[PDB]
Design a protein around this nucleic acid. Structure first.
Lengths: 200, 127, 226, 25, 97, 91, 63, 96
RNA sequence: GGUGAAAUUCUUGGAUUUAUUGAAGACUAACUACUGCGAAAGCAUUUGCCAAGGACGUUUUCAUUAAUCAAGAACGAAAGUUAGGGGAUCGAAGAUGAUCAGAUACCGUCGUAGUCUUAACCAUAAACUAUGCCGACUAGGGAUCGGGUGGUGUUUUUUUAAUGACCCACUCGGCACCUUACGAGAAAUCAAAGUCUUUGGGUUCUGGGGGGAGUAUGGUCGCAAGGCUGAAACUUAAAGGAAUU
RNA sequence: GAUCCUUAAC
């Protein structure tokens, strides 16, 4: 159900004689038998777990924390990464750019794995097959197949019913709409094909 | 005792920015440009309007209390025309007539080493 | 556009100088002139402590002003304020530069222009990118019109310039670099190293850029013991 | 009539002929 | 017929040279066909020379001069009158006034 | 002989799914089924286990890589950028 | 209103599309060796004294 | 350069390819140069460097993996380490 | 901010001027030339690695191994196509302000594809020197690039044992320039477009009034756009080249 | 910057 490989990596317990085994999101280039270095003093190498205050601008990070200690939230999907936009030491914070293109200021103590995540290019290949889609969602969850609401009865959906399959009312739904109404394009600022780019 | 700022003249086309800053550049004094002196839009780069803006700047910076100014004059530059506007000739004369002492005049127009791409198209501006 | 702006404010003065005050800026001990000028700052309110806003200012200053000599007029030096102590903030070397007029005057056609650049780290952990320019000259008694270089002279010249610069920086800290840059010992040294390859006049060193700042300067040398 | 625009017009005609023949095929 | 044995440019043994954009219209012209003129002027425009000399803090100042090579296209060169049409036998003169 | 003109590995899909989709699937499937050079033991024994997992049969090392290639262009760009920043930091 | 009385020393030729002005060289009675170039809408001879409100202009051409 | 002198050794000198023969020659003390590929296991590099420190044998790290080292030594197979027993007409021993 | 003038747009939520910076992508100015290399397309930051090349010099080797070439191939600006990456600038389409009798144009402000790169296609340009390649001979002159040769010629090591860069002449090989006409040509002009009615050095390709028409059809290559091959029916007395006032 | 056009040849 995950596009990216995971990395079984073992550290030593600093306080007791015992090995501690961790679950990492494998960055592209990590291999078995590779030493990785987690800490604020580590080098800027792929797989290391520097804080953002320790990495410089332009750094590719992944598995970045939102707050220091939540053990990774940002840029965890296959092939995704976070860009270190900039720093400010006073009121220690770091501006970063997220995979969606959004900028976020988060504390400089939050950690991340240097590099990009393995499994990149996954959505490049067309499934070609409802069977491939079936096996893809069989491990994820029960979200497939998707019946169109226009193809159902008015009891079952806002879009259902009619002598022709059509929505009837505008398919853009307001944010303040209630459950049972939020079917279609929720809070759509605009619709239709964009003759444009992301424009981050 | 001579305390000096830096002139920072921008003699673009259709505009003449004149504003004196400190020797560091981080603190600015008297940011006046041709528009604030001339009403008609076609004369924001007129020599008269640039002279007026420059003398206004000179009065403000002398009443702030600096005696000398090192001149740094600049055209639009980069990709653009690189030929300074009438303000370049008008403003320095305006400061000299005001009587603010002048030193170390230098052209600081930003030239590119292999500029990105000119504007106007391959056939250019077919006016 | 005095009467063109339909709205000056979409949402709907106190003179800055009154809250502002002057500060005095000094150079390091490698230049014959110490004072370089004055600078406005906001008043050091306890919430803000404008000393921090001072600690990050850079001033471009003419080497002619820093040396009282007209022959240094075409060079300029960036001085970065790094230490503030009581209205006599003193800077440090940040980078040297030329004047665009001097560069464009020294650049002429019917001759070859050679450029070299190095990224060498000094012995006091400073990392300097140095650029050195050089031009070809027609010899006396020459009748040829242009006096270009055969692109192997250019390569050997660039190699020798790079190694002279690297050897000079590797062995001297920043202060020695400034104190040997201002008499331009490099120019005659490199002409001596090159003259058996191609005449090559106008071998000035162009701009130089820094990357570092000093530490907290507590015990022996130049900043507090008095 | 510029030769380049006449060439373009002939390509337009060629495309239309090929379309109608593809239909009739 | 062939107006100019040089094809109105300077290309013999090249085939292709990198173009340069014009300064008036920003037309993309070949460099050999451009009409480059070097502009070298005093910054003060020579009417305020004495004014700036007396207003300067340093006597015997150099009064620096600006430099720029300036590229023209064939269309704007004739309009700007930096070049003009000449006689058929007068087109062969290669030297400047 | 040359058994197929252009469908190559995608001859298994026969006629269905559309020529363009089969073309893209060809381009990615040759990559995902090719053997890659192991940078450790130096011999072409790196195969894809699953999307992102690339095992070497001889040196018994698994590398984390692209879904259909052992390494992606974005990964190489990231490696170069990280190297440049690291070297700049050290000196 | 401060005015400057300056005498014309050189006539440089009629200037403008219609020739309604002449480009002239004017030297001030005070601060001699300060020379300026201006335009005069009428005809001018030598030893001709011109009263001007503001002396801070150069009039090079008119087209 | 380096591949040129290695080829000269191959033409004139005597050499052994491979870690086992390399370690044997190091033990018997008759090897003079060791050339170690770039991608050979670093544990093997440590072992060979220890053997060479014991033997007082010069070690040179080839700027290339076993494939390129084999190509430089003239063979069509991978070579992780090559010990030059003598060169004769090559100055490979004296230099580097 | 732009413009002849404006306007679209951004502004007591400071891009639009400065100081420090940081990032991205493209680009490689000035030096830059009647200069260089490459078969052409084309190629201009430093260094390294890889293989290649012209010219020169040779009292080196082989000895006709050569010239051009249907078929058949390699490379081929830009735009364009497929899909990744990239996506700063400029910008077919489009939005929009102006001009205008109209303006789905020029002008102004944005802006998707594109511009960039990887893999695969495409195979066209005024791809021009509108001049096929090889070989020989026929005027002069200076300049320039690369190589070589000669000169009690010029300057710094160390004016003392080696030399680089210059100066003079010669030569080979180039990119090219001035004049007449030996000649040529319809002329413009041409050291080749000369040595062709005093007609023959070798060889390849192409044309036969203007259209219809690079169309139709059949092949063939391409994902497509299209490329290559390529008519006829019919129509027309001119269409064209170079110079004159 | 609107200065768009000219009952048909001889």
């Amino acid at each position: 159900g995950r596009g990216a490989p995971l990395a079984k990596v073992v550290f030593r317990d600093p306080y007791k004689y015992r090995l501690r085994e961790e679950i990492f999101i494998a960055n592209e280039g990590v291999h078995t038998g590779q030493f990785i270095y987690a800490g604020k003093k580590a080098s800027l190498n792929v797989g290391n777990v520097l804080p953002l205050g320790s990495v410089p601008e332009g750094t590719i990070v992944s598995n970045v924390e939102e707050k220091p200690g939540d053990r990774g939230a940002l840029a965890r999907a296959s092939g995704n990464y976070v860009i270190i936009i900039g720093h400010n030491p006073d009121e220690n914070k770091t501006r970063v750019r997220l995979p969606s293109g959004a900028k976020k200021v988060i504390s400089s103590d939050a950690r991340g794995v240097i590099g990009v995540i393995a499994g990149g290019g996954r959505v490049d290949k067309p499934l070609l097959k409802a069977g491939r889609a079936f096996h893809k969602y069989r491990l994820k969850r029960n979200s497939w197949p998707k019946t169109r609401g226009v193809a159902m009865n008015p009891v079952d959906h806002p879009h259902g019913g009619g002598n022709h399959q059509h929505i009837g009312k505008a398919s853009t739904i307001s944010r303040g709409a209630v459950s049972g109404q939020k079917a279609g394009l929720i809070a759509a600022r605009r619709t239709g094909l964009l003759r444009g780019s992301q424009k981050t | 005792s001579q305390v000096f700022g830096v002139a920072r003249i921008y003699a673009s086309f259709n505009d003449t920015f004149v504003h004196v800053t400190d020797l560091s550049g981080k603190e600015t004094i008297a940011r006046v440009t041709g528009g604030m002196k001339v009403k008609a839009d076609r004369d924001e780069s007129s020599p008269y309007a640039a002279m007026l803006a420059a003398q206004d700047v000179a009065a403000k910076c002398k009443e702030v209390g600096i005696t000398a100014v090192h001149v740094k004059i600049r055209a639009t530059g980069g990709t653009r025309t690189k030929t300074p506007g009438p303000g370049g000739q008008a403003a320095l004369r305006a400061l000299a007539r005001s009587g603010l002492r002048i030193g170390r005049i230098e052209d600081v127009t930003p030239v590119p080493s292999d500029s990105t791409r000119k504007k106007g198209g391959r056939r250019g501006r077919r006016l | 556009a005095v009467g063109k702006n339909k709205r000056l404010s979409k949402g709907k003065v106190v003179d800055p100088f009154t809250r502002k005050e002057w500060f005095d800026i000094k150079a390091p001990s490698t230049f014959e002139n110490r004072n370089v000028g004055k600078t406005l700052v906001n008043k050091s309110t306890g919430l803000k402590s404008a000393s921090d806003a001072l600690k990050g200012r850079v001033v471009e200053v003419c080497l002619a002003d820093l040396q009282g000599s007209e022959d240094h007029s075409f060079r300029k030096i960036k001085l970065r304020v790094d230490e503030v102590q009581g209205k006599n903030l003193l800077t440090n070397f940040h980078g040297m530069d030329f004047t665009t007029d001097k560069l464009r005057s020294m650049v002429r056609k019917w001759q070859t222009l050679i450029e070299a650049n190095v990224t060498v780290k000094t012995s006091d952990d400073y990392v300097l990118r140095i650029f050195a320019i050089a031009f070809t000259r027609k010899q006396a008694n020459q009748v040829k019109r242009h006096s270009y270089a055969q692109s192997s002279h250019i390569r050997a010249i660039r190699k020798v310039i790079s190694e002279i610069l690297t050897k000079e920086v590797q062995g001297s800290t920043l202060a020695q670099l400034t104190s040997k840059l201002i008499p331009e010992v490099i120019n005659k040294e490199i002409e001596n190293a090159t003259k058996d390859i191609f005449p090559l006049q106008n071998i000035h060193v162009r701009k130089v850029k820094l990357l570092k700042q000093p530490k907290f300067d507590v015990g022996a040398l130049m900043a507090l013991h008095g | 009539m510029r030769a380049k625009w006449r060439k373009k017009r002939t390509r337009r005609l060629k495309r239309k002929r090929r379309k109608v023949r593809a239909r009739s095929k | 017929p062939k107006k100019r044995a040089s094809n109105g440019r300077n290309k013999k043994g090249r085939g292709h040279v990198k173009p340069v954009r014009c300064v008036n219209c920003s037309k993309s012209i070949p460099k050999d066909k451009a009409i480059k003129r070097m502009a070298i002027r005093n910054i003060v425009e020579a009417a305020a020379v004495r004014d700036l000399s007396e207003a300067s803090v340093y006597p015997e100042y150099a009064l620096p001069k600006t430099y720029n090579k300036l590229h023209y296209c064939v269309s704007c060169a004739i309009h700007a009158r930096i070049v003009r049409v000449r006689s058929r036998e007068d087109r062969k003169n290669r030297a400047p006034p | 002989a040359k058994r197929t003109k252009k469908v190559g590995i995608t001859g298994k899909y026969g006629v269905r799914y559309g020529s363009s989709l089969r073309r893209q699937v060809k381009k990615l499937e040759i990559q995902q089924h090719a053997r890659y050079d192991c940078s450790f033991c130096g011999k072409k024994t790196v195969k894809r286990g699953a999307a992102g997992i690339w095992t070497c049969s001889c040196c018994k090392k698994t590398v984390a890589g692209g879904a259909y290639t052992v390494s992606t262009a974005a990964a190489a760009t990231v490696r170069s950028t990280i190297r440049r920043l690291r070297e700049m930091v050290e000196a | 209103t401060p005015v400057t009385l300056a005498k014309v020393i050189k006539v440089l030729g009629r200037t403008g599309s219609r020739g309604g002005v002449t480009q002239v060289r004017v030297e001030f009675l005070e601060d001699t060796s300060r020379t300026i170039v201006r335009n005069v809408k009428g005809p001018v001879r030598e030893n001709d004294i011109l009263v001007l409100m503001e002396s801070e202009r150069e009039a090079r051409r008119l087209r | 350069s380096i591949n040129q002198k290695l080829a000269l050794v191959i033409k004139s000198g005597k050499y052994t390819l491979g870690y086992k023969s390399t370690v044997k020659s190091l033990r018997q003390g008759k090897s003079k140069l060791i050339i170690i590929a770039a991608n050979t296991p670093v544990l093997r590099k440590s072992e060979l460097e220890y053997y060479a420190m014991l033997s007082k044998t010069k070690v040179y790290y080839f700027q290339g993996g076993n494939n390129e080292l084999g190509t430089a030594v003239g063979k069509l197979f991978r070579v992780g380490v090559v010990s030059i027993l003598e060169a004769g007409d090559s100055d490979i021993l004296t230099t580097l």
